[PDB]
Amino acid sequence: MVAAAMLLRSCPVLSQGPTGLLGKVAKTYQFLFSIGRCPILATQGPTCS
């Protein structure tokens, strides 16, 4: 045949494609959708905690 593994990359699943941070975007934003005093500084606090 003529095919050296060069016809498969349509983002099928990759074993663990989904379930990679979703429910967070489907809730967090639901609250940070329309605040008011949006952050202008951005990253002004500590690097962690």
UniProtKB/Swiss-Prot annotation:
Domain of life: Eukaryota
Transit peptide: 1-49
Coiled coil regions, renumbered to chain: none
Tissue: Predomnantly expressed in erythroid cells.
Subcellular location: Mitochondrion inner membrane; Mitochondrion
Self-association and partners: Homodimer. Interacts with SUCLA2.
Record comment regarding domains: C-terminus is a mobile self-inhibitory loop which interferes directly with active site.
Record-stated family: Belongs to the class-II pyridoxal-phosphate-dependent aminotransferase family.
Protein's job: Catalyzes the pyridoxal 5'-phosphate (PLP)-dependent condensation of succinyl-CoA and glycine to form aminolevulinic acid (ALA), with CoA and CO2 as by-products. Contributes significantly to heme formation during erythropoiesis.
Name the record gives this protein: 5-aminolevulinate synthase, erythroid-specific, mitochondrial
Native source organism of the sequence: Mus musculus (Mouse)
Gene: Alas2
